[PDB]
Write a protein that binds this ligand. Structure first.
Ligand SMILES: O=c1ccn([C@@H]2O[C@H](COP(=O)(O)OP(=O)(O)O)[C@@H](O)[C@H]2O)c(=O)[nH]1
Ligand SMILES: OC[C@H]1O[C@@H](O[C@H]2[C@H](O)[C@@H](O)[C@H](O)O[C@@H]2CO)[C@H](O)[C@@H](O)[C@H]1O
Ligand SMILES: [Mn+2]
Length: 287
């Protein structure tokens, strides 16, 4: 029975987009009352899950930093379960976790192409939601491993379906978004359409919603394979088509997923997560 104005004040950030035409909040630093929400969610005794995949040398390059930072900054004050999907459990860094954190690790098959490693997450996440995550958590985030939490990433981010504004295009016009523009692809979005460009490095929602996001995305990924086409930005293209069709009930500002290569402009007030510098020459093994 949470009311949006109970926790969200768009007027605190008058200079950026804080509400979508479909009434979803865009959560920016300054607009959220975390104390109110912490109190609310704690009475509900929620648990929040976080999936992260590290296949190949992504493990050595990023997984420890990811997990160490998640331990420190993700949903502090609430039980969290980290779900770690790796192709080689023997390379799992087994960091010390803090109060209300715990984890479990799954061995997954390494797909041959990095593009398929990235896309197949959609299949695997849905399998895991059905098998166990739906029974374990109230909300789930699914995140890329190549990034680091920098400050509190808390219950202000929770909602039925949560999308991340991608850091380079948040002020852009839809016709500049890098949507899949080939009509042959399941992820196609025509010029003239589109609300935002969402980053596939972070998405979440309830287990039920995330199951639908991932299932729908993976259906498009498979469909494209049958049509001998691969979306230009892989699962991200599909995710953006998903969220065009099924609008997110919450969007996170680029503060929640920031690329410091851009610098730090005035709109980015408090960074909660930052991208790792890309290292494709080492961590990917195909073009
Ligand atoms: O070789 C692969 C490529 C991808 N990934 C996973 O898929 C995510 C998406 O790929 P990536 O981060 O490389 O895409 P980018 O953000 O650089 O476009 C990575 O963060 C990892 O979680 C992985 O573990 N190993
Ligand atoms: O297309 C989505 C894709 O974008 C990459 O980021 C790019 C950005 O799109 C581009 O404008 C800029 O010139 O370079 C950035 C990288 O240096 C992301 O890396 C990728 O993960 C997706 O978000
Ligand atoms: Mn990434």
């Amino acid at each position: 029975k949470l009311k949006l104005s109970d926790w969200f004040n768009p007027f605190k950030r008058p200079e950026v987009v804080t509400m979508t035409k479909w009434k979803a909040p865009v959560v920016w630093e300054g607009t959220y009352n975390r104390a109110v929400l912490d109190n609310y969610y704690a009475k509900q005794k929620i648990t929040v899950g976080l999936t992260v995949f590290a296949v190949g040398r992504y493990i050595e390059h990023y997984l420890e930093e990811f997990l160490t930072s998640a331990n420190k900054h993700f949903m502090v004050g609430h039980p969290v379960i980290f779900y770690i999907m790796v192709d080689d459990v023997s390379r799992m860094p087994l960091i010390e976790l803090g109060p209300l954190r715990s984890f479990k690790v799954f061995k997954i098959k390494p797909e041959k192409r990095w593009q398929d490693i990235s896309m197949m997450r959609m299949k695997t996440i849905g399998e895991h939601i059905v098998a166990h995550i739906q029974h374990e958590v109230d909300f789930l985030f699914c995140m890329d491993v190549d990034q680091v939490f920098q400050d509190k990433f808390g219950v202000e981010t929770l909602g039925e379906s949560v999308a991340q504004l991608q850091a380079w295009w948040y002020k852009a016009d839809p016709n500049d978004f890098t949507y899949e523009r080939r009509k042959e692809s399941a992820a196609y979005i025509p010029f003239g359409e589109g609300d935002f460009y969402y980053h596939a490095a972070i998405f979440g929602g309830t287990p039920t919603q995330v199951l639908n996001i991932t299932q729908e995305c993976f259906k498009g990924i498979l469909k494209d394979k049958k049509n001998d086409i691969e979306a230009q930005y892989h699962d991200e293209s599909h995710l953006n088509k998903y969220f065009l069709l099924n609008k997110p009930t919450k969007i996170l500002s680029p503060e929640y997923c920031w690329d410091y290569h851009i610098g730090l402009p005035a709109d980015i007030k408090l960074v909660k997560m930052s991208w790792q510098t890309k290292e494709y020459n080492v961590v990917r093994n195909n073009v």
